[PDB]
Amino acid sequence: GFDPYAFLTHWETGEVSTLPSGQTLREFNIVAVDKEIEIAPGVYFPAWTYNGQVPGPTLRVTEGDRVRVHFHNAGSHPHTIHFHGIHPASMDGVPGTGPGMIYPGESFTYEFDAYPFGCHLYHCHAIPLKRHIHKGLYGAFIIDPDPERHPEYQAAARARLLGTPENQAWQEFVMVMNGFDTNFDEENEVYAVNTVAHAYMKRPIRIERDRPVRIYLINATEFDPINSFHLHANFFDYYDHGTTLTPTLKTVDTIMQCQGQRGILEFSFNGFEPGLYMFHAHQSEFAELGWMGNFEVIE
Amino acid sequence: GFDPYAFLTHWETGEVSTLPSGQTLREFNIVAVDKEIEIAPGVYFPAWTYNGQVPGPTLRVTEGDRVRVHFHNAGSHPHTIHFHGIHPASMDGVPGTGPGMIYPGESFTYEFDAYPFGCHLYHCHAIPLKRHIHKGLYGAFIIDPDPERHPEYQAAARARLLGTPENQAWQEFVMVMNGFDTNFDEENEVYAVNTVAHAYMKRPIRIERDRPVRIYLINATEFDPINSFHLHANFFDYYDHGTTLTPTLKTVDTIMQCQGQRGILEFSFNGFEPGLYMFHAHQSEFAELGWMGNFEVIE
Amino acid sequence: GFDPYAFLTHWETGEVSTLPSGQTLREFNIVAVDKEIEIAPGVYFPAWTYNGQVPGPTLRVTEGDRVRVHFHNAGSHPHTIHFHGIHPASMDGVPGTGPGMIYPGESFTYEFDAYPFGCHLYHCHAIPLKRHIHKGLYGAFIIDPDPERHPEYQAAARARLLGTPENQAWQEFVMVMNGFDTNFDEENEVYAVNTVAHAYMKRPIRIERDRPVRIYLINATEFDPINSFHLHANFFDYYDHGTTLTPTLKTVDTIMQCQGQRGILEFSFNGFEPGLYMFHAHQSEFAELGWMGNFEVIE
Amino acid sequence: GFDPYAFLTHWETGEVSTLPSGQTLREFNIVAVDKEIEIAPGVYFPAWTYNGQVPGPTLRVTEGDRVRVHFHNAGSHPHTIHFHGIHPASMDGVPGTGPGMIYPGESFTYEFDAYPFGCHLYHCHAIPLKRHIHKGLYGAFIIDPDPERHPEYQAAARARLLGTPENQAWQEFVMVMNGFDTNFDEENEVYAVNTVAHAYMKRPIRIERDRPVRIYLINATEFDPINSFHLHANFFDYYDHGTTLTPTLKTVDTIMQCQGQRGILEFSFNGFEPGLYMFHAHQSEFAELGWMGNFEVIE
Amino acid sequence: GFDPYAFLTHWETGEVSTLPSGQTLREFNIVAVDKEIEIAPGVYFPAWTYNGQVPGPTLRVTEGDRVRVHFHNAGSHPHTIHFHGIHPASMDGVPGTGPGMIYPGESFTYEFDAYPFGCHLYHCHAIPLKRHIHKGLYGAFIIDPDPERHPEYQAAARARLLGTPENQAWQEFVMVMNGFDTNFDEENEVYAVNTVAHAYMKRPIRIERDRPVRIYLINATEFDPINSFHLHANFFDYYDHGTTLTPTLKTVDTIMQCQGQRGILEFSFNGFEPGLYMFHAHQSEFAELGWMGNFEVIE
Amino acid sequence: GFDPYAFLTHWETGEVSTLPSGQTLREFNIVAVDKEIEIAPGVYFPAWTYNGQVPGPTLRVTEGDRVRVHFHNAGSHPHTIHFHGIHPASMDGVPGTGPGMIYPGESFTYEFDAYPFGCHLYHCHAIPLKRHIHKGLYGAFIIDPDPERHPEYQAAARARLLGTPENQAWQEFVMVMNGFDTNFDEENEVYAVNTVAHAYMKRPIRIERDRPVRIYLINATEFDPINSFHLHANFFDYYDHGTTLTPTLKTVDTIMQCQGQRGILEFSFNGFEPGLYMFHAHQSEFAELGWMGNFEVIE
Ligand SMILES: [Cu+2]
Ligand SMILES: [Cu+2]
Ligand SMILES: [Cu+2]
Ligand SMILES: [Cu+2]
Ligand SMILES: [Cu+2]
Ligand SMILES: [Cu+2]
Ligand SMILES: [Cu+2]
Ligand SMILES: [Cu+2]
Ligand SMILES: [Cu+2]
Ligand SMILES: [Cu+2]
Ligand SMILES: [Cu+2]
Ligand SMILES: [Cu+2]
Ligand SMILES: [Mg+2]
Ligand SMILES: [Mg+2]
Ligand SMILES: [Mg+2]
Ligand SMILES: [Mg+2]
Ligand SMILES: [Mg+2]
Ligand SMILES: [Mg+2]
């Protein structure tokens, strides 16, 4: 069922309402379920999934929102959701606090205010740690800045806030670097952005020349210490964790992340000759094994 | 014999005196001695140690102090002390300059002015390099900034200068990420912060939530290319090598270091729910094998 | 045949002329050729090379120059040149665009305007990716800033522009960190800076005390995820990708890069005691196997 | 508990009495006991020991003495004492004669006249042979020549008879070359003289250069076919098995022994510069792993 | 088919006659033949043999005899006989001289005067060297001294000359130490003296107390660098290569030989308590795997 | 460049002068240099060499000479020269005394009086021991007896003193048994006398029948415990370490040495049929892998 092309630009914004205090509330339903995923045609991986897909749903909210994630375990092992973000210890999704792990058939609502703004992620933190992550229990968590709380960077914040006219000008994509050890010997056999090896070689990502591009880039790769992103023929600005509104790194073409690191890349192909522009890990073996894709820059 | 709980807050400041010039002088005695260390109850590692402990003593001085380290080798192999700091070539603690390696029964006094301020480390640099480090000859070296030399940053410099009333408001900890290859095949079997696997799970580190937290974090891990630190439920500011009084990275929750890298982490649990807040490597294998700890945040 | 001591300070600036536009043109000739290279005396490696050496020629131009690289393949396999730099898709040196791979006996002229200013590199991007890089098809590509286009940073840009009186004060070196898998099992047996293991221990790099030092440092090491640079007894400023004229990191002594990353290091031994100051990877095994050198600081 | 520095010069001469015949009688108590031994600080070896030490007690008697060794097995496995000396078959300490093996809780008295004079040894001879030796059941057995039975060699015989004024001019040492397979795969991981690896590098053996030196040297090393002794900067005379009062080999600096071989080395540092003079196996691997020591020659 | 108990005392002295010179001639017939041999009951080894047994026939002559060995090859591979002895190059039994190797169906008569007196051996020297020896082509070759040519040592020479009344007093045995690699991976699985593992534990060698004992001991063991002989409860004199009539080593109980070395051991159990006296390699693993025997000393 | 045939009979006697005391002085210049050596045509070994050759120069002096060896390290690692011979501890060439190891670019003069007479050797003693030896840093060191100091053995001493009429009658050769682990797994793949596998099979060593032969035989082989020498068709006298003027062993054809042992072999082919007489290790695998040669006895 998983569609890596639709996944690129799918934002789950939840069912929105207003709390008695006036605070915006966003509610999400997440079910852990054991399910086959196809990481290449005829390559079946037995995954543990959030909502039947790997990566899990890309959750996207605004700084200051109240977030409720109704988590139900319909799997066979205990699971949690550990968010990278600010929240109480009892909402941290680790085995030793709060409700602990959520056992098969049980439910729990993670609830917190969405801080800090930036690019984040969530993943299972069960026993043992590496197993539940590698099996597929990870996803993206994006907290848009509230432009009313950043007057000194108003234009930047508005460009990131989903649905403003300024944000509609941007071409936004979410990319989770992941990998799979199909024979379960703690070494990856397949690498990818968004699970399907070479998916963006088979169908390049169409890019309109005149508009800028923003990527929310997350490293969920297990076993290997780092992953990386190299943009052919062009340079980008990098925002580590996306937690600042000015770049961490200006004018680079290769960055690296250990697992759990992530950030925002911004660049533009304005004025570029139309054609295919490659992007891939600069660990060459990862790129050969599926972590390589093409932007199709059109005029 | 090693106490990882006392080690967290123990600073060796030396025997202090004043040179004729009026410059402050700090003197340290360090003895290399072969010794067993317990890295888990019932797991004995045959170490080469500075002063009978792994990590070695945490040395803490002030920028511009004259430092004398009286080094004596009571072991069976040649050793040195190589400091990560500014010093003359003959004081660099490598085989090919100055006294060279210090053989069993020999002595040498490393002497230098303490520059630059920041978070540093020292370790053996003998033959072969990886062996003397892995065996346990490494420690922390902290140079507090002299606030009188940083007028534009007096408040930040005073917050780091040991014993100041501004400094006493901070909760300071030293954390050395290390690992041990028990069967000596150049692959770590046990990982830890401050040597004892899971020590801060058995006994969490108590934090008063009203006061901010500062960690001096150093990577001494051999064989593996990087190590990392992920703070649950919260974000910190990172000061690479601690050599600036303004942060290198603002608002992150996961950073990585290669061996010999190090820096300062500052954050606060003010206003957080009392509970257990985890900290650990984001290389999952490392965390399972002992590089996982808990902060106990209290009212 | 390869001289690592001359390579350190050799800049290929090309056949220079003026287009009808008035724009400066620099032409280079690059031939791919299969050739033995000696990575230690008596250790022969079967290389694929650019112009008969590994690393390939260091090409150095000015921001805004028109660059033409006439590439001919006199080897036995297809090859390309992929530049890290801004250029059209058809000039990106990858198999699926423009002329594609350049087969034995074929020629192709890569042409682009030299942007952005900074420290870059080129390497083969053929099938399979890791093979052509490991075999030796990589080199440095340095784009000096045009001081006229950076008024607020004139002095910094003049110090980097090859040939100016400000630039002549600087002691500039190029260092490619590489490695060789002699038994072709995807694991390096030999590490180095500029190909020849321990070359700068046999013959240290002479540094005059009273003039600053600039290193263009590039990671071309295959298979291993990262490489690193530690400067003994001193600290440097680091300019990631060299693409900014102010430092990325201030006052550091150990930095790391994944493959394809690179940057500029600036430091000074002014006032230091003359002698040998070591520099090497902080991955201890790389240092033992050849990636270790000495600066000989003189008066 | 084992002190390799005291062991060098410790002779067990027994409880001495006179039989009705007038023959001298020396009585020894030896108890087999399973015990941990430290072969390096933090390296514990589970040994089978004679009197709680490896090597066992060095027994020293005079040619023609009646010897009674009261053996008691306080271990968990059957053991014997097999002496390298002249004795009846029923006193030979092998499974198939006399009392056979001595089972836990059993006792037996080995009794024989001490012949021939020279340097000998004793060790377990149980099933399997290699296991009981490797586990630590071996020791030195020295039979001093009776000068009254060697008129033509009275001066040499008196130089060896313990306590004589001629003997007191000599500096005598006992050295057992041994090894330990810590993971029990029939390959030694640690080598030593007198058990503790590098013990005489940590603390050199003090020699008065005016007085000659005699070493009783015994090979107890299992698995490896030979062991050896190289004396730096000097030459010695070798007495194979110590069974002649004139040398077997004159003026050599390197000798080898298979297991169970042994002999006497005599030399002098008279007139030599005070300094450290090395002694070690000429099997380089053995020396690196702990069979290396220093003589400290003093005025 | 092979009887290790008869082999011990079997001397082949040849078809004896007188040349026209007056010089004694001894003729022997040796056939190479491929044959199974039993190295323990139920353990069959595919041998290449001289005259259908391993070791080959023990040939015993007198110093100065003319020797003719008519060699025929009835095997499937080429073979030679290389004697340890003085002879012309054309009679040396190596591939590149004289007749070369002797191929299936071919014959050749090796002819030489028997010098020097001592304990020697013969073996195949074909391609590859180790294969033909391991497969079983070796045997003893004993040259008795001519008492007439050694006036100052008449008694010693008479005691070695087969058949004299002095020689009849001696109990003479021949012992070839050998080994077998049954899975042909160049590592012995079975060790022995005279081929049959533990043959002299099953049936000890009867020794009359009041007569001395002489052993002709030869090392034919392949792959392992040395073999050894330890006599329990007694000491012997050793005559290296048997080529001197006075001992090389006096009063020893453990001696070692590399392959092709050999010598004579002389000892006496006169006055000993009757019983079993063990003899075996002091390489413990060889002894466990078959190279261990017993003398049964009688009254 | 290395010529194993010229090496056989090349004696480096140094530049000779007379000290103020009247003592003869011999000075030698030795440079450590990394260099390829060819151990078979097309088999390149990356060696560490003394004066660009393996084995190093054969140094030959007279008992009582003052020896000065001006050692310069032009290599990439630290090195020493450890002589087997009598000398002060500060001249012993070990890391822990005197100047210690000699680092790249440094120089040191080893100086001592040449005692005792005999056959000796020199080799590097650096960290780790086995590596520097195996890499090629070993050579022969021969101290001729001074006939004026040995009146009782005047003829013997004169026969060994280089250049006397008596010595000119002898045919003298130096033979260093060595081996190379080409894949650096601590097991030799190639064996040889004087480095080049089978060199004296390709060109036999021409021997004049009427004159006696003397070989200075040294074991420099690493990893394997022993090496050996078997002389076909003839017997020799052996002088252990060459330190005595009468034989250690009379009339043998096979001797063995552990590493660092050495000695003198003397024999004669007077009266022998002209032809090829083989000599080789009696460890058969060594002989197959290159340690085999031929004497060509001519009339
Ligand atoms: Cu889970
Ligand atoms: Cu995470
Ligand atoms: Cu050390
Ligand atoms: Cu360091
Ligand atoms: Cu290519
Ligand atoms: Cu690249
Ligand atoms: Cu026992
Ligand atoms: Cu024994
Ligand atoms: Cu054969
Ligand atoms: Cu032979
Ligand atoms: Cu060396
Ligand atoms: Cu040596
Ligand atoms: Mg796998
Ligand atoms: Mg390990
Ligand atoms: Mg490899
Ligand atoms: Mg073992
Ligand atoms: Mg086998
Ligand atoms: Mg090998």
Nearest to E177 by CA among E104, E115, E121: E121
- DSSP for F92-139, please give it: S--TTSTT-SB-TT-EEEEEEE--S-EEEEEE---SSHHHHHHTT-EE
Structure tokens given for C140: 């440095």
**Cβ atoms of E43 and E179 closer than 8 Å:** no
Peptide bond into C116 cis (omega under 30): yes
* C203 contacts chain A (CB < 8 A): no
Give the CA count within 13 Å in the CB-facing half-sphere of A198: 9
Number of C-beta neighbours around residue A154 at 10 A: 14
Structure tokens given for C1: 């045949």
**Cβ atoms of B52 and B137 closer than 8 Å:** no
Please report the beta strands in C51-88, taking only residues with DSSP state E, as ranges in sequence order: 59-62, 66-73, 82-83
Angle at A144 between CA A139 and CA A150, to 5 degrees: 150
**Cβ atoms of E187 and E147 closer than 8 Å:** no
b/e burial code for range A276-296 (CB count within 10 A of at least 16 → b): bbbbbbbbbbbbbbbbbbbbe
Nearest to F255 by CA among E89, E145, E248, D236: E248
Peptide bond into B95 cis (omega under 30): no
- Cα–Cα distance for residue pair F27/C126, rounded to 1 Å: 59
Nearest to A24 by CA among A160, A162, A154, A122: A162
Chains C and D touch (3+ CB pairs under 8 A): no
User: Residue C129 and residue A256: Cβ atoms within 8 Å?
Assistant: no
Residue of B nearest to A259 (CA): B282
Gap from CA of E185 to ligand 17 centroid (Å)? 5
Q: What CA–CA distances, in Å, run from F127 to D189, D289, E134, F135, F296?
A: 19, 12, 39, 12, 42
Q: Exposed, middle or buried by CB within 10 Å (0-12, 13-18, 19+), for E53? A: buried
- DSSP for F244-276, please give it: SSS-SEEEESEEEEETT-EEEEEE--TTPPSEE
Q: Exposed, middle or buried by CB within 10 Å (0-12, 13-18, 19+), for C106? A: middle
User: Residue F226 and residue D226: Cβ atoms within 8 Å?
Assistant: yes
Displacement of CA B105 from its chain's centroid (Å):
27
- Cα–Cα distance for residue pair C281/C190, rounded to 1 Å: 13
- Cα–Cα distance for residue pair C55/C142, rounded to 1 Å: 14
Mutate to test the interface with C, among B240, B245, B257 (most CBs of C within 10 A): B240
Structure tokens given for D268: 């002098």
Nearest to A81 by CA among A39, A140, A34: A140
* D205 contacts chain B (CB < 8 A): no
Q: Which ligand is nearest to the CA of E219?
A: 10
Q: What CA–CA distances, in Å, run from C253 to B85, B224, C237?
A: 8, 20, 9
b/e burial code for range B12-23 (CB count within 10 A of at least 16 → b): bbbeeeeeeeee
Q: What CA–CA distances, in Å, run from A70 to A16, A90, A123, A135, A138?
A: 14, 15, 15, 21, 16
User: Residue C226 and residue A251: Cβ atoms within 8 Å?
Assistant: no
Structure tokens given for C31: 């031939």
- DSSP for chain A, please give it: ---HHHHTT--B--EEEE-TTS-EEEEEEEEEEEEEEEEETTEEEEEEEETTBSS---EEEETT-EEEEEEEE-SSS-B--EESS---GGGS--TTSTT-SB-TT-EEEEEEE--S-EEEEEE---SSHHHHHHTT-EEEEEEE--GGG-GGGHHHHHHHSTTSHHHHHSEEEEEEEEEE-TT-SSS-SEEEESSSTTHHHHS-EEEETTS-EEEEEEE---SSSEEEEEETT--EEEEETT-SSS-SEEEESEEEEETT-EEEEEE--TTPPSEEEEEE-SSHHHHHTT-EEEEEEE-
Gap from CA of A84 to ligand 2 centroid (Å)? 6
After which residues does a break in chain A occur, C–N more than 2.5 Å? none
- Cα–Cα distance for residue pair B289/B293, rounded to 1 Å: 12
Nearest to E282 by CA among D58, D125, D48: D125
* F127 contacts chain C (CB < 8 A): no
Residue of D nearest to B104 (CA): D202
Mutate to test the interface with A, among C63, C113, C246, C258 (most CBs of A within 10 A): C258
User: Residue F260 and residue D282: Cβ atoms within 8 Å?
Assistant: yes
User: Residue F74 and residue C202: Cβ atoms within 8 Å?
Assistant: yes
Q: How was this structure determined?
A: X-ray
Annotated binding residues of B for Cu cation, written as ranges, equal 79, 84, 123-124, 132, 282
User: Residue F130 and residue D224: Cβ atoms within 8 Å?
Assistant: no
**Cβ atoms of D194 and D8 closer than 8 Å:** yes
User: Residue F297 and residue E89: Cβ atoms within 8 Å?
Assistant: yes
B16 phi, psi to nearest 5 deg: -95, 140
Nearest to E31 by CA among E128, E139, E119: E139
**Cβ atoms of F110 and F86 closer than 8 Å:** no
At B50 the three-state DSSP class reads: strand
- DSSP for F72-88, please give it: EE-SSS-B--EESS---
- Cα–Cα distance for residue pair B281/B292, rounded to 1 Å: 7
Please report the beta strands in C14-166, taking only residues with DSSP state E, as ranges in sequence order: 15-18, 24-40, 43-50, 59-62, 66-73, 82-83, 107-113, 118-123, 138-144
Gap from CA of A118 to ligand 2 centroid (Å)? 15
**Cβ atoms of F44 and F182 closer than 8 Å:** no
Query: What's the order of all strands across the beta sheet hosting C262-267?
Result: C190-193, C171-180, C213-219, C262-267, C236-240, C249-252
**Cβ atoms of A64 and A72 closer than 8 Å:** no
List CB contacts (< 8 A) between B288 and chain A. 128-130
Angle at E40 between CA E278 and CA E283, to 5 degrees: 40
- Cα–Cα distance for residue pair F293/F175, rounded to 1 Å: 11
E-F contacts at Cβ under 8 angstroms: 88
User: Residue F101 and residue B78: Cβ atoms within 8 Å?
Assistant: no
Angle at D224 between CA E194 and CA F289, to 5 degrees: 75
Four-CA torsion D46, D50, D53, D57, nearest 10 degrees:
-160
Q: What CA–CA distances, in Å, run from A20 to A66, A111, A146, B216?
A: 12, 16, 20, 44
Gap from CA of E148 to ligand 9 centroid (Å)? 37
Residue F134 annotated as binding site: no
Number of C-beta neighbours around residue C15 at 10 A: 11
* Contact residues, F window 81-120, toward B, CB-based 8 Å cutoff: 95-96, 100-101, 103-104
**Cβ atoms of C130 and C224 closer than 8 Å:** no
Structure tokens given for F77: 């690692």
- Cα–Cα distance for residue pair B173/A139, rounded to 1 Å: 33
- Cα–Cα distance for residue pair B141/C286, rounded to 1 Å: 25
User: Residue E226 and residue F230: Cβ atoms within 8 Å?
Assistant: no
* D201 contacts chain B (CB < 8 A): yes
- Cα–Cα distance for residue pair D114/D25, rounded to 1 Å: 10
Q: What does the radius of gyration of chain C's CA atoms come to, in whole angstroms? A: 19
Give the CA count within 13 Å in the CB-facing half-sphere of C36: 7
Q: Exposed, middle or buried by CB within 10 Å (0-12, 13-18, 19+), for D170? A: middle
CA-based nearest distance E102→chain D, Å: 36
Q: What CA–CA distances, in Å, run from F215 to E88, E192, F47?
A: 21, 35, 26
At D76 the three-state DSSP class reads: coil
- Cα–Cα distance for residue pair D297/D231, rounded to 1 Å: 13
* B46 contacts chain A (CB < 8 A): no
Residue D185 annotated as binding site: yes
List CB contacts (< 8 A) between F141 and chain D. none
Structure tokens given for E30: 């040796």
Mutate to test the interface with C, among F76, F77, F184 (most CBs of C within 10 A): F76
Give the CA count within 13 Å in the CB-facing half-sphere of C91: 21
- Cα–Cα distance for residue pair B269/B277, rounded to 1 Å: 10
E170 contacts: CB under 8 Å, gap ≥ 6: E159, E211, E212, E213, E214
Q: Which ligand is nearest to the CA of B186?
A: 14
3-state SS of chain D: helix, strand, coil percent to 5? 15, 45, 40
* Contact residues, F window 139-168, toward D, CB-based 8 Å cutoff: none
The one-letter code for the residue type at D122 is Y
Length of chain B as a residue count = 299
Number of C-beta neighbours around residue A27 at 10 A: 15
b/e burial code for range A211-228 (CB count within 10 A of at least 16 → b): ebbbbbbbbbbbbbbbbb
CA-based nearest distance B130→chain A, Å: 20
User: Residue D202 and residue B75: Cβ atoms within 8 Å?
Assistant: yes
**In angstroms, how far is the first alpha carbon of chain B from the final one?**
32
Give the CA count within 13 Å in the CB-facing half-sphere of A42: 0
Question: H-type helices in chain D, by residue range?
Answer: 4-7, 129-134, 154-160, 165-168, 199-202, 284-288
**Cβ atoms of A243 and B252 closer than 8 Å:** yes
- Cα–Cα distance for residue pair C114/C125, rounded to 1 Å: 20
Length of chain E as a residue count = 299
**Cβ atoms of E56 and E178 closer than 8 Å:** no
Four-CA torsion C281, C287, C289, C293, nearest 10 degrees:
100
E13 phi, psi to nearest 5 deg: -110, -5
Number of C-beta neighbours around residue A182 at 10 A: 14
B-C contacts at Cβ under 8 angstroms: 85
B145 contacts: CB under 8 Å, gap ≥ 6: B62, B63, B117, B153, B156, B157, B160, B161, B245
Displacement of CA F163 from its chain's centroid (Å):
19
**Cβ atoms of B142 and B176 closer than 8 Å:** no
Number of C-beta neighbours around residue C184 at 10 A: 11
At C133 the three-state DSSP class reads: helix
